[PDB]
Paper text:
For tg-SwDI mice, which harbor the Dutch (E22Q) and Iowa (D23N) mutations within the Aβ sequence, we observed three different polymorphs. The other two polymorphs, labeled DI2 and DI3, consist of a single protofilament and account for 37% and 11%, respectively. For DI2 fibrils, an atomic model of residues D1–V39 could be built into the 4.2 Å map. Except for the N-terminus, the fold is similar to the fold of DI1 fibrils. However, although the medium-resolution map allows for straightforward modeling of the main chain, the assignment of the side chains is ambiguous. The presented atomic model represents the best visual fit to the density, and its similarity to the atomic model of DI1 fibrils further adds to its reliability. In this most probable DI2 model, the N-terminus is fixed in its position by a salt bridge between D1 and K28i+2 as well as a hydrogen bond between E3 and S26i+2. The second β-sheet found in DI1 is also present in DI2. Finally, in contrast to wild-type Aβ42 fibrils, in which negatively charged and solvent-exposed residues E22 and D23 induce a kink in the main chain, in DI1 and DI2 fibrils, mutant residues Q22 and N23 are interior, in extended conformation.
Author numbering:
A (entry chain D), B (entry chain E), C (entry chain C), D (entry chain B), E (entry chain A): 1 to 39
Write the structure that this text describes.
């Protein structure tokens, strides 16, 4: 399996008035935001 | 399997007034936002 | 498996008025935001 | 498995008015933000 | 497994008005922010 074999693009411009934010370049796994119950 | 074998494009412009945000370039797995019940 | 075999791009521009933020380049695992219940 | 085999890019520009922030280059494991319940 | 085999990039520019911050280059393990309950 091959992915992004050459140049790519991604960006977010002029963000404001945020409460919860999560920025990740690469994530080889799991991402969790707001959790209440126990694991 | 081959994907994005050459140049690509992606972006978000002029974001404002957000509560919950999650930005990821590449995610080889799972993504979770708002969760209440336990895993 | 091969990924991002060449140049790439990612960025966030002009962020303001944030409460909770999490920025990661590479994450080979799990990411947690707001958690209340015990693990 | 091969990832980011060549140049890459990532950045955050002009951040202000933050309460909780977490910046990581590489994270081969887990990341926790706000936790209340015991582990 | 191979990652970041060549040049890379990451930075945060002009940060201000922060309460809790955590900056890490590489983290081969776990990261904790605000914790209340005992481990």
């Amino acid at each position: 399996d091959a992915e992004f074999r050459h140049d790519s693009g991604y960006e977010v411009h002029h963000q404001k008035l945020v409460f919860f934010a999560q920025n990740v370049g690469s994530n080889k796994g799991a991402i969790i935001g707001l959790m209440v119950g126990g694991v």
